[PDB]
């Protein structure tokens, strides 16, 4: 196989691929690898245009969602952060394969473990402390919610970087942040 069926990513060095506040104003690098019932994930977000380059005084949180359908295939429409033309799929070299994901449920967060109506439940969350800029003097929290911004028969991943309130005139930028979850299949 030319591609790796155990990995779904945005490629290592994606181009601005999100229009969070304004058109293509951010780069979301996300890689998901399936290891049995657990997905090892590494996410990273950085502002490249507009307010994301200069965190507004009132901003306390910056977040993105990835909503998938019942086959685990990403849906490129609000509120999914990645734009329609953005790379997302099996890994093939430093790029993405053009094949459609046919084992998508292997990467989706398990709904029995994280019921769609349970996003507020601590268990549907993996919360950690990290640092803006990667600067240890600028602590922030990262919360990953599982299936909280769902449909039905659908799945989702939500990433919230909070505690930004006290960080101004700084571009929004996170370190590579790790996380994991039990898989649907």
């Amino acid at each position: 196989t030319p591609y790796d069926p155990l990995t779904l990513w945005t490629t290592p060095d994606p181009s601005p691929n999100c229009s969070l506040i304004q058109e293509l104003d951010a780069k979301l690098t996300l890689c998901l690898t399936k290891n049995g019932s657990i997905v090892n994930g590494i996410v990273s977000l950085v502002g490249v245009k507009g307010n994301l380059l200069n965190i507004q005084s009132t901003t306390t949180t910056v977040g993105v969602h990835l909503v998938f359908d019942e086959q685990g295939r990403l849906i490129t429409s609000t509120p999914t952060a990645l734009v329609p033309q953005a790379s997302w799929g099996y890994r093939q070299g430093q790029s993405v394969s053009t094949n459609t994901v046919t084992n998508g449920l292997g990467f989706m967060p398990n709904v029995s473990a994280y019921p769609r109506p349970n996003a507020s439940e601590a268990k549907s969350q993996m919360v950690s402390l990290t640092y803006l800029q990667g600067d240890t003097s600028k602590p922030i929290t990262m919360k990953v919610a599982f299936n909280g911004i769902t449909s039905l028969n659908g799945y989702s991943l939500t990433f919230m970087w909070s505690g930004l309130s006290n960080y101004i005139n700084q571009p929004f930028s996170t370190p590579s942040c790790s996380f994991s979850y039990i898989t649907q299949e």
């Binding site: 030319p2 591609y3 490629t11 060095d13 181009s15 601005p16 058109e23 293509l24 490249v48 245009k49 734009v83 329609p84 033309q85 790379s87 799929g89 093939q92 070299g93 430093q94 790029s95 993405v96 394969s97 053009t98």
Partner: protein
């Protein structure tokens, strides 16, 4: 891939620099076309700063403030295989490594150009 190696372009302040980036596409490269130019200024510590972009059949500029209005793709048909750009009225601040990334999943290529700007002509 891109048709030219990593090169060094030496120009004089005020002149215009032509940064060539021509590419060929493979039959396999069936994904959407993305062209991104980044820059790592010599004067500061920033690296891989987005300069101009071609995504979803549209051009997006206005990313790097100091280079505002002085960057444009040279070709009127990028898809044909030419991602080249021009940096007009060069300033000493423009010195740095400019990178051209041309992507068509699964295809990906990049080229690095080290642009040097001299106060007055001569590399003699």
């Amino acid at each position: 891939g891109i048709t030219t190696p990593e090169e060094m372009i030496e120009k004089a302040k005020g002149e215009t620099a032509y940064l060539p980036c021509k590419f060929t596409l493979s039959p396999e490269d069936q994904g959407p076309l993305d062209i991104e130019w980044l820059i790592s200024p010599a004067d500061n510590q920033k690296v891989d700063q987005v300069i101009i972009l071609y995504s979803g059949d549209k051009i997006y500029d206005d990313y790097y403030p100091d280079l505002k209005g002085r960057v444009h793709f040279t070709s009127n048909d990028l898809k044909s295989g030419d991602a080249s750009i021009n940096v007009t009225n060069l300033q000493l601040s423009d010195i740095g490594t400019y990178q051209c990334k041309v992507k068509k999943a699964p295809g990906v290529a990049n080229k690095k150009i080290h642009l040097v700007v001299l106060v007055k002509p001569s590399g003699a």
